[PDB]
Ligand binder design. Structure first.
Ligand code: HEM
Ligand SMILES: [Ca+2]
Ligand SMILES: [Ca+2]
Ligand SMILES: [Cl-]
Ligand code: NA
Length: 338
């Protein structure tokens, strides 16, 4: 190892340059190292950046997008006008000055910010962070970002088209354990996808499998019924939790928080280098912070007022759910991330 000063160490000396970026964003973008709206947006941005890539396009002799290349920032004017990217201009205009201030590529900044963001959440992962992506990019083609109204067929096809199996899609969706909607229905902006959007835990997997009982929003734009007031459910998460191709992996995560973390780290390592050549990158993973000391449950809980009878069993070849514990107390509305 070498030292960067002040007791901070890295394997690769060039990585020391990322500590001033760390300090700036933890203080001035993430509100002192929190896992709240900006951290969630940073995680979401890694995917909106990387998903602008198409193996099929490449096979047809067309440009499919340069993947995890910072194009969502370099060409925010273009990409934020894509339908599934609506409203992302608040995020891209917020993020851009940090990349520019520190002289790092947009492509590295997007991956660095999502790694740091996720690492702020209790229970959270420590994503691999490789640096070195060119600052020269081209805009993503339109039509490549999944939409929450898309069927499981269409989403799984789009994801296979950037290199991910349906099992890996479920692993990537561990991100919706730290997540809310702002644009599907602005009337209920901040309504999260699980009861714990600051905790990287298995509650998204448990709660998405419950029967829907009420709408949080107006039921437009891909919202379907969720199982707790204040919690928002996407049609796409409903479809993937219950599709034969994905359901058994979805179920297998409800009682293994650590495997959810490990699997998320594994798939995000791939996501962050889509369109990139890893041998051209430098490993700066040791700049990424450790998550808060916090004991996150390894096994998820049914929310208050729910029993095992409320859980949809969609996995066939695998096998039954364990009696998951039930959280104590009354039914309570999930607070929005505002
Ligand atoms: C598989 C297809 C996916 C669909 C259809 C989908 C859909 C969405 C939608 C509709 C939102 C709310 C956007 C808004 O109105 O504010 C959202 C939020 C979010 N998504 Fe996904 N998503 C997908 C995959 C992913 C992936 C692969 C990741 C990252 C690994 C991700 C990370 C997030 C995060 C962290 C948020 C919360 C952002 C915030 O709270 O500010 N999603 N997703
Ligand atoms: Ca991109
Ligand atoms: Ca959660
Ligand atoms: Cl670098
Ligand atoms: Na790894």
């Amino acid at each position: 190892m070498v030292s960067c000063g002040g007791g901070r160490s890295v394997k690769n000396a060039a990585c020391c340059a990322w500590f001033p970026v760390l300090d700036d964003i933890q203080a001035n973008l993430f509100n002192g190292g929190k896992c709240e709206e900006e951290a969630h947006e940073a995680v979401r941005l890694t995917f909106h950046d990387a998903v602008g890539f198409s193996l099929a396009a490449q096979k047809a002799g067309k440009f499919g997008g340069g993947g995890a290349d910072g194009s969502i920032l370099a060409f925010s004017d273009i990409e934020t006008a894509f339908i599934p990217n609506f409203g992302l201009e608040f995020t891209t205009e917020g993020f851009i000055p940090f990349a520019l201030a520190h002289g790092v590529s947009f492509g590295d900044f997007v991956q660095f910010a999502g790694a740091v963001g996720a690492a702020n959440c209790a229970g959270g992962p420590r994503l691999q962070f490789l640096a070195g992506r060119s600052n020269i990019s081209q805009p993503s083609p339109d039509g490549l970002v999944p939409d929450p109204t898309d069927s499981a067929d269409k989403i799984l096809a789009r994801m296979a088209d950037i290199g991910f199996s349906p099992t890996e899609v479920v692993h990537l969706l561990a991100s919706h354990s730290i997540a809310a909607q702002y644009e599907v229905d602005t009337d209920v902006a901040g309504s999260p996808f699980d009861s714990t959007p600051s905790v990287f835990d298995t509650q998204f997997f448990v709660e998405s499998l419950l029967h829907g009982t009420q709408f949080t929003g107006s039921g437009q734009g891909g919202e379907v019924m969720s199982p707790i007031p204040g919690e928002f459910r996407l049609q796409s998460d409903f479809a993937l939790s219950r599709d034969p191709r994905t359901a058994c992996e979805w179920q297998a995560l409800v009682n293994n928080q650590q495997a959810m973390v490990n699997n998320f780290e594994a798939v995000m390592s791939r996501l962050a280098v889509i369109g990139q050549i890893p041998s051209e990158l430098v490993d700066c993973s040791d700049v990424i912070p450790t998550p808060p000391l916090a004991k996150v449950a390894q096994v998820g809980s049914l929310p208050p007022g729910k029993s095992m009878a409320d859980v949809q069993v969609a996995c066939t070849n695998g096998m039954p759910f364990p009696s998951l514990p039930t959280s104590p107390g009354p039914v309570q509305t999930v607070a929005p991330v505002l």
